[PDB]
Design a protein around this motif. Structure first.
Motif, PDB file in Angstrom:
ATOM      1  N   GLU A   3     -23.657 -30.075 -10.070  1.00  0.00           N
ATOM      2  CA  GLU A   3     -22.973 -30.183 -11.353  1.00  0.00           C
ATOM      3  C   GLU A   3     -21.740 -29.297 -11.399  1.00  0.00           C
ATOM      4  OE1 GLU A   3     -25.198 -28.662 -14.624  1.00  0.00           O
ATOM      5  OE2 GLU A   3     -23.975 -29.692 -16.128  1.00  0.00           O
ATOM      6  N   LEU A  23     -22.113 -21.571 -17.051  1.00  0.00           N
ATOM      7  CA  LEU A  23     -23.188 -22.546 -17.216  1.00  0.00           C
ATOM      8  C   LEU A  23     -24.100 -22.579 -15.994  1.00  0.00           C
ATOM      9  CD1 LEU A  23     -24.581 -24.933 -18.628  1.00  0.00           C
ATOM     10  CD2 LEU A  23     -22.955 -26.409 -17.450  1.00  0.00           C
ATOM     11  N   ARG A  50     -21.525 -29.907 -17.319  1.00  0.00           N
ATOM     12  CA  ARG A  50     -21.300 -29.450 -18.685  1.00  0.00           C
ATOM     13  C   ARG A  50     -22.158 -30.119 -19.760  1.00  0.00           C
ATOM     14  NH1 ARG A  50     -17.248 -32.412 -20.667  1.00  0.00           N
ATOM     15  NH2 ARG A  50     -15.445 -31.751 -19.426  1.00  0.00           N
ATOM     16  N   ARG A  51     -22.577 -29.282 -20.710  1.00  0.00           N
ATOM     17  CA  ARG A  51     -23.483 -29.651 -21.785  1.00  0.00           C
ATOM     18  C   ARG A  51     -22.785 -29.495 -23.126  1.00  0.00           C
ATOM     19  NH1 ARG A  51     -28.600 -25.783 -22.341  1.00  0.00           N
ATOM     20  NH2 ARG A  51     -28.495 -25.542 -20.069  1.00  0.00           N
ATOM     21  N   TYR A  52     -23.053 -30.425 -24.036  1.00  0.00           N
ATOM     22  CA  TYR A  52     -22.512 -30.341 -25.383  1.00  0.00           C
ATOM     23  C   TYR A  52     -23.325 -29.364 -26.217  1.00  0.00           C
ATOM     24  CZ  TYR A  52     -21.502 -31.673 -30.208  1.00  0.00           C
ATOM     25  OH  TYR A  52     -21.178 -31.663 -31.543  1.00  0.00           O
ATOM     26  N   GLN A  53     -22.628 -28.564 -27.020  1.00  0.00           N
ATOM     27  CA  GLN A  53     -23.289 -27.638 -27.924  1.00  0.00           C
ATOM     28  C   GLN A  53     -22.396 -27.400 -29.129  1.00  0.00           C
ATOM     29  OE1 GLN A  53     -25.614 -26.682 -29.774  1.00  0.00           O
ATOM     30  NE2 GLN A  53     -26.883 -26.604 -27.922  1.00  0.00           N
ATOM     31  N   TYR A  91     -23.424 -37.314 -20.456  1.00  0.00           N
ATOM     32  CA  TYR A  91     -24.629 -37.603 -21.219  1.00  0.00           C
ATOM     33  C   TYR A  91     -25.045 -39.061 -21.088  1.00  0.00           C
ATOM     34  CZ  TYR A  91     -25.191 -33.036 -23.290  1.00  0.00           C
ATOM     35  OH  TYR A  91     -25.431 -31.697 -23.484  1.00  0.00           O
ATOM     36  N   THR A 105     -22.707 -26.295 -33.734  1.00  0.00           N
ATOM     37  CA  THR A 105     -23.500 -25.831 -34.860  1.00  0.00           C
ATOM     38  C   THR A 105     -23.356 -26.784 -36.039  1.00  0.00           C
ATOM     39  OG1 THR A 105     -23.895 -23.989 -36.386  1.00  0.00           O
ATOM     40  CG2 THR A 105     -21.618 -24.343 -35.648  1.00  0.00           C
ATOM     41  N   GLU A 106     -24.440 -26.922 -36.795  1.00  0.00           N
ATOM     42  CA  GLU A 106     -24.473 -27.757 -37.984  1.00  0.00           C
ATOM     43  C   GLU A 106     -24.408 -26.879 -39.225  1.00  0.00           C
ATOM     44  OE1 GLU A 106     -25.703 -30.276 -34.692  1.00  0.00           O
ATOM     45  OE2 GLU A 106     -25.893 -28.164 -35.217  1.00  0.00           O
ATOM     46  N   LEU A 107     -23.943 -27.467 -40.321  1.00  0.00           N
ATOM     47  CA  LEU A 107     -23.839 -26.755 -41.589  1.00  0.00           C
ATOM     48  C   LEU A 107     -25.220 -26.388 -42.119  1.00  0.00           C
ATOM     49  CD1 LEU A 107     -21.554 -25.843 -43.536  1.00  0.00           C
ATOM     50  CD2 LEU A 107     -20.813 -27.253 -41.612  1.00  0.00           C
ATOM     51  N   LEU A 141     -21.528 -21.474 -44.030  1.00  0.00           N
ATOM     52  CA  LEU A 141     -21.840 -21.932 -42.682  1.00  0.00           C
ATOM     53  C   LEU A 141     -22.349 -20.814 -41.784  1.00  0.00           C
ATOM     54  CD1 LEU A 141     -21.821 -23.894 -40.280  1.00  0.00           C
ATOM     55  CD2 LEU A 141     -19.416 -23.330 -39.965  1.00  0.00           C
ATOM     56  N   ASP A 201     -17.934 -30.695 -11.795  1.00  0.00           N
ATOM     57  CA  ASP A 201     -17.050 -30.251 -12.867  1.00  0.00           C
ATOM     58  C   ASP A 201     -15.766 -29.647 -12.310  1.00  0.00           C
ATOM     59  OD1 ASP A 201     -18.301 -31.141 -15.098  1.00  0.00           O
ATOM     60  OD2 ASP A 201     -18.853 -29.164 -15.878  1.00  0.00           O
TER      61      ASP A 201
END
Lengths: 8, 533, 547
Positions: B61, C247, A1-4, B108, A6-8, C136, B65
């Motif tokens: 992976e 994923l 799993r990957r972090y994702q 990470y 959105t920014e303001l 936003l 998980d």
């Protein structure tokens, strides 16, 4: 799993 | 207990990182081979190694998980079940957020360590840039992050306070319209909104500063390694393919370290909020026949709120079979406490007591709860169906004919049949399905269905209707088999106490009257005062 | 759809008072996206410089452009976030204030039929979702939709066939992301449903804790909670398995394009067309393009949820109240006569009130008694102009009560409920409630006249001490004393007291039956016993909603 996110 | 799978998950993560590492190293060496004008065997072998290593990484992976899950979920479920069992005798969001953040941190962290390891595989000089700029990547954004988090949590707390004030006004709306003070509530809301507006400018400044610091540190590092590697390629000690690898390596390492900075405070907050929950976490003889009788010998009890101060003393009543005992007077005499002690809710603070020749803890807990069932101070109906609500706590499910017989005995059979689908009707929570008299009848039926040895039913008909009280008194006076199981009437209706064989009364934590009802009236005690009242 | 269009138009109209922040953020967004697109091309230029003959001028120029564009892209991205979060907060505060202001003026029946949690969810959680649309989500969608086209310009600028490969590759990624997002949303809905079920189970278990402990049924409830937790854990496992599978297939397709693109690029290399730096820049652009496409798709998915939340909130502020406008009548002198005539009241959910007719006098103390299912308070509620009578009318000085000034009527006709309610403020605020600014001397004069100063003078700073929220710090006698003090401090002309002999001491009744503001003011007292019959000048009765 990957972090994702959105920014303001 | 789950280490046997957690170690496998960890080694799975490590091997997945090693396999994933195949893209940049092999593409850099492959472009170096292009510059080397070598034969196609090396190119084909490198492409095959690319594909095989990274597909093994992806499969590994996924397996890791899937092994971390089905295990962390089990741990979370067991923890929540244990917490609920402990509080019986708010957490799930904390648990799964902690699990997600912990697994992201581990993934990470291993990825960054593997990155740095294969940096050290290559030229050491290009790694030196990363090893000196890492403290600048770590210390300063960690400094700005707590500032930004503090401002954000202050803003959120102020928003919660403002919403609470607004919802309080919304709930109190009839009084507000009575006083015609809508503009006052509007001004009160507006002041808190102004304070929030005041804090938000500082919050935005902190957000911008944090973003500036993170971006400038990371991409300053990205340009620094490029400059150093260009200088070394001019020096000739490093091939250009190694620089090609190192550029992508820096992108991946920057992403990994930025994920680590974005994740670590959440882990710290989660464990800090879980420590308080972890703190908050903290055989008998089985009868095989009729109990017969129970008695107490000047027993004393104390309230759990103030265990050093006794609640009442001098319990000498004996639950004689075929007879009905009585209890009436001031509520401070501990009549409710005596009822709780009769239900083995707590050990006595003094004196002695017996039940079927044995103390209450000596008898089995299931048998004691099944043979000494009593109606509560206020009738309560669970959210399940009536056929399920009239059989709560049963060790084994009995036939519905017995439930119908008990409902007919308590008179609630007609009320149950009035509802659709008979006694299998779904009952609304907290007794909202029917009236209070129906709830009292349901409680009486539930008490009767258990076939108790010593009924301690009280405070039911006193708060119920007059017709329900008359029906309850008629049922109590018409108990078959020479009254069968004894009773202890502690209701407020003294009219039903005329049939008591050995009546009694208590006042001020001790007994004050007893004997026949006519003898109690002819006395000069609390019973005489009640008779004259 | 048309409703979504008008909802987004209303959102833009709400965002209109923050135009300078919007244009500044948009300008900083463009300045960030230009440099972010431009940098990897210069990186490929650096690699191409190093590959060939050494040119110190070209290397120095490329490194200088690195430093300049790096500082520009780092600086321009940070300011955009600050401006956009400031715009977010401004929109959130404005919509919160407008929603509360529109909710205040609605009729009593609307709050009667609607649960408090329903309003709380709209006011607290959904008002956060108001400000997620333009500051936003629109920003992220715009930046993705401009950076994708810029990155596709660059790749074409590199080599066309390698771009045709990307064009062929993208639609499978788009379809996979759409499918995964839909399934994830459905499973999240199931997750929150099961969590709500478990919460209901634990609430039911803890509500009847005494009953369960008496019956010894804790094991059964524990087993039911374990079953609910097992269902929740199974659903969580299903969700996480689906996400991990998505994923895995995403990474597999990522190499499925990567290896073949590398092969074709190296064939072009050996043909002598491309260089090493150009291929590296193309690789960076390819790595970015896919992620930008997926985040664009996810944000466009979030668009519809935010628009639905916008419709849900705007349904409240668009709800038309059903109360007539005041006639703004405010006589200088009021005799205080109140007359009822053949009035009828119907609850919004049944003739609760029917055919009531009487007439009150200033100097005459009038009492109304009668159980009638505890519906006697509806007479006072109708008298306070809280509800509109279905038939007949209520008249003060031969004038309907609707035409009177809303402030003046409630500053003239004051009643006290059966359960007094406090507003979590000071005693100074909670006694002079409904008053903008009046002297304190009258405040503790009325407090002394209401037999309430006993717990006031014993508490610090007199009337400036703080009480608990909703008044929960004090007891019922203090509630009645504070209510009487509040009623007296406004100096009313028509005074209504409910359950005076049912929930209050006779000292309060004696004070309210002999005060200077109660000796010659119109008084209507409602009691549940005959304790007020002996002192009432006139007594009236009612049963089943009729006289």
């Amino acid at each position: 799993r990957r972090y994702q996110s959105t920014e303001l | 207990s789950e280490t046997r799978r957690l170690s496998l998950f960890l080694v799975l993560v490590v091997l997945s990182s090693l396999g994933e590492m195949a893209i940049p190293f092999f593409t850099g060496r492959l472009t170096d081979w292009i510059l080397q004008d070598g034969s196609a065997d090396t190119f084909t072998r490198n492409l095959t190694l690319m594909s095989i290593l990274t597909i093994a990484s992806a499969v590994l992976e996924f397996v890791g998980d899937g092994i971390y899950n089905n295990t962390m979920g089990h741990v979370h479920s067991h923890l929540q079940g244990e917490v609920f069992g402990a509080v019986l005798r708010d957490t799930s969001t904390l648990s799964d957020s902690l699990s997600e953040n912990l697994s992201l941190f581990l993934w990470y962290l291993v990825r960054g360590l593997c990155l740095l390891g294969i940096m050290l595989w290559g030229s050491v000089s290009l790694t030196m840039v990363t090893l000196i700029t890492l403290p600048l990547l770590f210390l300063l954004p960690k400094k700005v992050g707590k500032w930004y988090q503090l401002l954000e949590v202050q803003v959120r707390e102020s928003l919660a306070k403002s919403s609470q004030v607004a919802i309080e006004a919304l709930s109190a709306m009839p009084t507000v319209r009575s006083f015609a003070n809508e503009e006052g509530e509007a001004q009160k809301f507006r002041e808190k909104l102004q304070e929030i507006k005041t804090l938000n400018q500082k919050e935005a400044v902190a957000y911008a500063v944090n973003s500036w610091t993170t971006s400038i540190s990371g991409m300053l590092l990205k340009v620094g390694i490029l400059y150093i590697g260009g200088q070394l390629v001019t020096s000739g000690a490093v091939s250009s393919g190694n620089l090609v690898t190192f550029v992508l390596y820096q992108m991946q390492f920057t992403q990994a370290v930025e994920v680590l900075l974005s994740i670590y405070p959440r882990v710290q907050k989660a464990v800090g909020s879980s420590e308080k929950i972890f703190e908050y976490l903290d055989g008998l003889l089985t009868p095989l026949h009729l109990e017969g009788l129970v008695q107490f010998q000047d027993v004393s009890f104390a309230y759990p709120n103030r265990p050093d101060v006794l609640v009442l003393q001098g319990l000498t009543f004996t639950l004689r079979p075929g007879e009905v005992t009585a209890l009436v007077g001031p509520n401070g005499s501990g009549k409710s406490t005596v009822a709780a002690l009769l239900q083995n809710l707590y050990q006595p603070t003094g004196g002695q007591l017996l039940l079927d020749g044995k103390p209450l803890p000596q008898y089995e807990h299931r048998y004691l709860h099944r043979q000494v069932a009593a109606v509560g101070q206020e009738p309560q109906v669970f959210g399940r169906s009536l056929q399920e609500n009239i059989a709560y706590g049963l060790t084994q499910k009995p036939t519905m004919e017995e439930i119908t017989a008990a409902a007919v005995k308590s008179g609630a059979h007609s009320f149950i049949s009035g509802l659709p689908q008979g006694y299998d009707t779904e009952v609304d929570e907290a007794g909202s399905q029917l009236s209070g008299g129906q709830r009292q009848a349901v409680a009486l039926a539930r008490a009767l269905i258990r076939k108790p040895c010593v009924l301690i039913l009280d405070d039911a008909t006193s708060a119920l209707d007059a017709n329900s009280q008359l029906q309850v008194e008629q049922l109590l006076y018409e108990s078959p088999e020479r009254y069968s199981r004894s009773v202890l009437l502690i209701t407020q209706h003294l009219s039903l106490v005329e049939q008591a064989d050995h009546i009694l009364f208590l006042e001020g934590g001790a007994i004050r009257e007893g004997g026949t009802h006519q003898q109690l009236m002819e006395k000069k005690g609390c019973y005489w005062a009640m008779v004259q009242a | 759809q048309v409703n979504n269009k008008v909802l987004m138009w209303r959102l833009l109209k709400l965002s209109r008072p923050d135009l300078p922040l919007l244009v500044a953020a948009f300008f900083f967004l463009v300045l960030a996206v230009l440099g972010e697109t431009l940098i990897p091309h210069y990186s490929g230029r650096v690699i191409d410089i190093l590959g060939g003959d050494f040119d110190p001028h070209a290397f120095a120029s490329a490194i200088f452009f690195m430093c300049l564009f790096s500082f520009g892209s780092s600086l321009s991205a940070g300011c955009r976030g600050g401006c956009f979060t400031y715009t977010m907060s401004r929109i959130n505060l404005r919509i919160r204030e407008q929603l509360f202001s529109s909710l205040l003026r609605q009729d009593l029946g609307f709050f009667q039929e609607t649960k408090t949690g329903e309003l709380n969810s709209r006011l607290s959680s959904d008002t956060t979702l108001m400000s997620n649309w333009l500051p936003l989500n629109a920003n992220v969608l715009l930046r993705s939709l401009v950076k994708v086209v810029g990155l596709y310009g660059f790749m074409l600028s590199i080599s066309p066939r390698l771009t045709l490969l990307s064009l062929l590759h993208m639609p499978f990624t788009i379809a996979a992301e759409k499918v995964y997002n839909t399934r994830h949303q459905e499973v999240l809905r199931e997750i929150q449903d099961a969590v709500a079920r478990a919460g209901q189970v634990v609430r039911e278990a803890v509500g009847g804790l005494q009953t369960v402990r008496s019956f010894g049924a804790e094991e059964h409830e524990v087993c039911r909670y374990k079953e609910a937790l097992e269902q929740c854990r199974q659903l969580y496992w299903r969700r996480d398995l689906e996400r991990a599978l998505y994923l895995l297939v995403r990474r597999v397709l990522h190499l499925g394009v990567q290896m073949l693109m590398l092969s074709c690029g190296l064939q072009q290399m050996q043909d002598g067309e491309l260089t090493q730096g150009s291929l590296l820049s193309f690789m960076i652009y390819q790595e970015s393009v896919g992620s930008y496409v997926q985040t664009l798709v996810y944000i466009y998915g979030d668009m519809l949820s935010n628009v639905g939340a916008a419709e849900k909130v705007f349904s409240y502020m668009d709800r038309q109240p059903n109360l007539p406008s005041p006639g703004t009548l405010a006589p200088t002198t009021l005799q205080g006569v109140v007359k009822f005539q053949d009035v009828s009241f119907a609850y919004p959910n049944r003739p609760v009130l029917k055919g009531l007719t009487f007439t009150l006098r200033p100097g005459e103390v009038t009492a109304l008694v009668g159980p009638n299912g505890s519906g006697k308070s509806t007479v006072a509620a109708l008298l306070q102009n809280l509800y509109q009578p279905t038939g007949g009318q209520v008249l003060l000085d031969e004038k309907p009560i609707s035409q009177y000034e809303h402030c003046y009527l409630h500053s003239q006709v004051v009643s006290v409920g059966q359960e007094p309610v406090l507003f979590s403020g000071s005693v100074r605020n909670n006694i002079a409630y409904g008053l903008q600014s009046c002297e304190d001397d009258k405040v503790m004069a009325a407090a002394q006249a209401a037999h309430a100063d006993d717990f006031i003078q014993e508490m610090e700073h007199g009337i400036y001490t703080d009480v608990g929220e909703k008044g929960s710090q004090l007891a019922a006698g203090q509630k009645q004393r504070l209510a009487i003090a509040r009623a007296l401090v406004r100096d009313p002309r028509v005074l209504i007291l409910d359950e005076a002999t049912s929930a209050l001491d006779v000292q309060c009744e004696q004070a309210l039956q002999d005060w200077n503001s109660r000796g010659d003011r119109t008084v209507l007292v409602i009691a549940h016993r005959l304790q007020t019959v002996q002192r009432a000048h006139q007594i009236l009765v009612l049963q089943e909603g009729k006289l």
